[PDB]
């Protein structure tokens, strides 16, 4: 906790030194904020204070939604997150959208929501093998089920009206990625539905595994269809992705590990 407060104070000391540098140069309100916007190091430190602010909001959101990290998903976020930091960074620069401090702020909103879906997956994965789960865990995770799926429904609705009214822009890849995230909250629901009927009965159910393998087959078919339609569009309009082939190979492998295993079983 000491190193966390040190990191916050060592970032806020730079922001209070950048702001006090501009206010001495341009002694008013309006030419100061304009000067921060055009200057590169002045907007850089204001970016750093923004990321520390969204870091600490994530840590307090993780603390209220999960009681304690198991230190086995703590690594598992770190590789995925890196995965996610780089491909948003590559999608931001390939599209020639130019560095704007309201679409960078949108991209870390996608990454912040993407990290919370992944944390829900690993928590519901150990909900399979947790024989001692309180009612606080059950309510606090279905709250995470609702709050996410409504949020991606809202941003899909915001994006597919943006792709019609405005035209072809970067708002297409936002709503498509949230549509994949909409399938992602869809996956963890059915997995929570089948594992809630598991705990209420003091006997194993063989059809639960059959429904779980069928459900993973389902959405995996939905996932590759979303990625394949995502391929066919941006070759036609704008330019080659050069990204999003990262989770696609995992999406075919998700389809490979589900369809072929069910074919070998059934």
């Amino acid at each position: 906790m000491f190193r966390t407060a040190v990191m916050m104070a060592a970032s806020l000391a730079l922001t209070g030194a950048v702001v006090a540098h501009a206010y001495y140069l341009k002694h008013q309100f309006y030419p100061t904020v304009v000067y921060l916007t055009k200057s590169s190091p002045s907007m850089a430190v204001l970016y750093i204070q923004a990321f520390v602010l969204v870091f600490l909001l994530g840590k307090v959101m993780g603390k209220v939604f999960f009681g304690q990290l198991r230190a086995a998903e703590m690594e598992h976020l770190l590789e995925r997150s890196w995965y996610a930091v780089t491909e948003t960074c590559l999608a931001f620069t390939v599209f020639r959208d130019d560095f704007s401090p309201r679409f960078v702020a949108l991209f870390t909103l996608l990454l912040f929501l993407k990290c919370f879906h992944w944390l829900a997956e690993d928590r519901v994965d150990f909900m399979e093998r947790s024989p001692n789960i309180s009612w606080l865990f059950h309510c606090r995770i279905v709250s995470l089920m609702f709050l996410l799926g409504i949020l991606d429904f809202l941003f899909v609705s915001h994006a597919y009206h943006s792709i019609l009214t405005r035209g072809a822009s970067v708002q297409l890849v936002f709503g498509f990625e949230y549509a994949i995230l909409m399938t992602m909250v869809l996956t963890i629901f059915i997995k929570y539905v089948l594992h809630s009927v598991d705990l209420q009965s003091e006997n194993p159910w063989d059809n639960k595994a059959v429904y779980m393998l069928y459900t993973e087959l389902f959405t995996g078919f939905i996932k590759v269809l979303l990625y394949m339609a995502f391929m066919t569009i941006m070759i036609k309009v704008h330019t080659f992705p050069l990204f999003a082939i990262r989770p696609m190979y995992l999406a075919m492998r998700q389809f490979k590990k589900a369809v072929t295993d069910a074919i070998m079983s059934r």
Partner: protein
């Protein structure tokens, strides 16, 4: 005596080196001791001007007096500039005009531009376009002659408050249309062909439409277009190079020679040289002027720079009445100069500070929903107002929400 002046002009026209220019003036400064009436007027304009001889204002005033008693046009002009600017000497506008009139009488061209400009913007005298037509005319004839010989030496226009062939033949064709070369003269249609030549940027065409709007040929003679067409011709003389002598003094760290080589051109009636000669006095870098006569003198040259159509000079005339720079604090007077830069020149900042006087109840009676309009109007006018309105509108709604809770 006279043999010393020939050596200086030979090295000045032959060598462009800074040391060689100063070495050439060593004989010229020595020739000034012999009272050669041509010798002092080239070192008078270095003793008080700088970037030549070392700057010493008190060393030039007393030897300007003997130039006046001799009756020199170049001495009658500059001694008026001393009393107009209050430079080293107590300020007096009363006989600042008296020296300028005799310089204008004596045949000097600088004393005609300033006397013309004073008659045009109504500074020190009554605004009379008839008198402003006469004095601006004599400069235009004496500069339109030399550009056809010198080729029109163009000089860049640098404003410190912002940082720190095809048409040549159309002039002769339009000249033949009005006069008549093989065809009957038609003043109704020769006006449009002549006026289109000035849009290319050449100032020979700028002269010829001024005479067109003077005598009443073609179009009825209006005062406003009579001298404004004349003025832009006069602002491009051989004294138009004097921004560079002043601007190089600013970049070389000699800030007290960029406030004297700019205050003459501010007196000559510019707007590039009236904001810049006030921006230097804005930050108190000048040292000839006292610390108590630094803001009222910078208010005078911010006031002339605004009436000639500058956006920043109309905002920065609001600031000086907003905080109380050089004047007792007036929120009502500062209010007007902020709106006059909003409706007229559409300056993006000038409606943001309109919101602040609307939001916080300064000058006028407070109204919360009227202030919302001007913050919103600021974001439409510019791309850079999107940020500092958003943190102003969020603060705006916090007061509206907190007041509603208390009710």
């Amino acid at each position: 005596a006279e043999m010393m002046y020939q050596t200086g002009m030979k090295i000045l026209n032959g060598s462009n080196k800074k040391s060689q220019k100063r070495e050439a003036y060593r004989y010229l400064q020595k020739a000034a001791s012999m009272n050669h009436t041509k010798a002092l007027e080239r070192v008078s304009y270095a003793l008080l001007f700088g970037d030549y001889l070392p700057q010493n204002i008190q060393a030039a005033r007393e030897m300007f007096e003997k130039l006046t008693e001799e009756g020199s046009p170049k001495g009658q002009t500059a001694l008026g500039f001393l009393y107009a600017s209050g430079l080293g000497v107590n300020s007096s506008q009363a006989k600042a005009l008296v020296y300028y009139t005799f310089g204008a009488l004596g045949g000097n061209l600088i004393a005609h531009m300033v006397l013309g400009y004073r008659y045009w913007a109504g500074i020190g005298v009554l605004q009379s376009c008839e008198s402003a037509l006469t004095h601006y005319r004599l400069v235009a004839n004496h500069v339109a002659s030399d550009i056809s010989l010198t080729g029109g030496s163009v000089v860049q226009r640098i404003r410190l408050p912002d940082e720190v062939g095809w048409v040549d033949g159309q002039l002769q064709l339009g000249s033949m249309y009005y006069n008549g070369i093989g065809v009957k003269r038609d003043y109704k249609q020769a006006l449009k062909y002549f006026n289109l030549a000035s849009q290319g940027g050449h100032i020979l065409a700028f002269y010829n439409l001024a005479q067109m709007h003077a005598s009443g040929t073609g179009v009825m003679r209006s005062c406003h277009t009579a001298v404004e067409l004349f003025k832009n011709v006069c602002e491009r003389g051989r004294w138009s190079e004097r921004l560079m002598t002043a601007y190089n003094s600013y970049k070389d760290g000699d800030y007290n020679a960029a406030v004297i080589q700019y205050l003459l051109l501010a007196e000559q009636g510019y707007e590039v040289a009236q904001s810049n000669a006030a921006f230097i006095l804005d930050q108190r870098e000048a040292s000839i002027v006292g610390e108590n006569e630094t803001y009222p003198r910078a208010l005078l040259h911010w006031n002339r720079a605004a009436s000639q159509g500058y956006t920043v000079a109309r905002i920065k005339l609001g600031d000086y009445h907003f905080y109380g720079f050089g004047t007792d604090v007036d929120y009502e007077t500062a209010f007007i100069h902020y709106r006059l830069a909003s409706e007229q020149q559409h300056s993006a900042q000038a409606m943001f500070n309109l919101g602040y006087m609307h939001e916080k109840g300064l000058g006028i009676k407070q109204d919360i929903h009227l202030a919302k309009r001007f913050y919103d109007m600021a974001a439409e006018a510019s791309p850079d107002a999107q940020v500092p309105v958003f943190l102003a509108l969020c603060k705006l709604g916090v007061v509206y929400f907190l007041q509603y809770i208390r009710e």
